[PDB]
């Protein structure tokens, strides 16, 4: 599979945080919490708020410790008075595997989705499951087949995986 490499300081996120059961449970749901963020006008006022640290809006998958999984729609920004009634979070810094997802949303990113899980699973040692994982946004027409979503899967120690050796 084709990835990048990439690297990222500590980051403040600002957006909102809702939490399903599990992963799965999740996947019914997300697509509604992006509707109604939309619809409320939720997207807009973030896309007000982007720093360009990163360059889109963020889908993050937050892993918790009983075992839910909470996503939060964000984007990265900083000053406090203005962040308002928002969820706020550190992202700790990280390196990644990035990879691309071409094709109209949300269909070309589960699917690219699926990919990336199956090829995971040989670097085990590598990967952080506790470390949020997420897609990212760019702007452009998401119904284009030529749309580009990223996504960013943490690791660690990557470079002393036999394969690269
Ligand atoms: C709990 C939460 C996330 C993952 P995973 C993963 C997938 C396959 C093999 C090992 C790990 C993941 C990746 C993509 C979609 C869903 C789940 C995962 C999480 C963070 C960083 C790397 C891998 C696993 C368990």
Request: hydrophobic share 35%.
């Given at each position: 599979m084709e990835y990048q490499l990439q690297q990222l300081a500590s980051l403040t996120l600002v957006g909102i945080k809702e939490t399903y059961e599990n992963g799965r449970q999740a996947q019914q749901h997300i697509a509604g919490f992006w509707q109604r963020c939309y619809?409320?006008?939720?997207?807009a006022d973030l896309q007000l708020k982007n720093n360009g640290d990163l360059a889109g809006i963020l889908g993050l998958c937050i892993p918790e410790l009983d075992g839910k999984m909470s996503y939060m729609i964000a984007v990265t920004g900083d000053n406090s008075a203005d962040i308002a009634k928002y969820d706020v979070i550190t992202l700790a810094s990280s390196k990644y595997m990035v990879f691309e997802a071409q094709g109209a949303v949300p269909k070309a990113v589960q699917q690219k989705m699926e990919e990336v899980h199956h090829y995971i699973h040989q670097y085990q040692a590598?990967?952080?499951?506790?470390?949020?994982?997420?897609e990212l946004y760019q702007d452009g027409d998401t119904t284009s087949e030529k749309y580009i979503t990223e996504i960013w899967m943490p690791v660690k120690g990557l470079e002393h995986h036999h394969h690269h050796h």
């Amino acid at each position: 599979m084709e990835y990048q490499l990439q690297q990222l300081a500590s980051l403040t996120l600002v957006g909102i945080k809702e939490t399903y059961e599990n992963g799965r449970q999740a996947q019914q749901h997300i697509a509604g919490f992006w509707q109604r963020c939309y619809q409320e006008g939720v997207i807009a006022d973030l896309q007000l708020k982007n720093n360009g640290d990163l360059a889109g809006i963020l889908g993050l998958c937050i892993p918790e410790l009983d075992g839910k999984m909470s996503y939060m729609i964000a984007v990265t920004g900083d000053n406090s008075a203005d962040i308002a009634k928002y969820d706020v979070i550190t992202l700790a810094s990280s390196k990644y595997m990035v990879f691309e997802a071409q094709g109209a949303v949300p269909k070309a990113v589960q699917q690219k989705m699926e990919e990336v899980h199956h090829y995971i699973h040989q670097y085990q040692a590598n990967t952080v499951k506790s470390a949020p994982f997420f897609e990212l946004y760019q702007d452009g027409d998401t119904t284009s087949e030529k749309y580009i979503t990223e996504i960013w899967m943490p690791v660690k120690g990557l470079e002393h995986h036999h394969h690269h050796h």
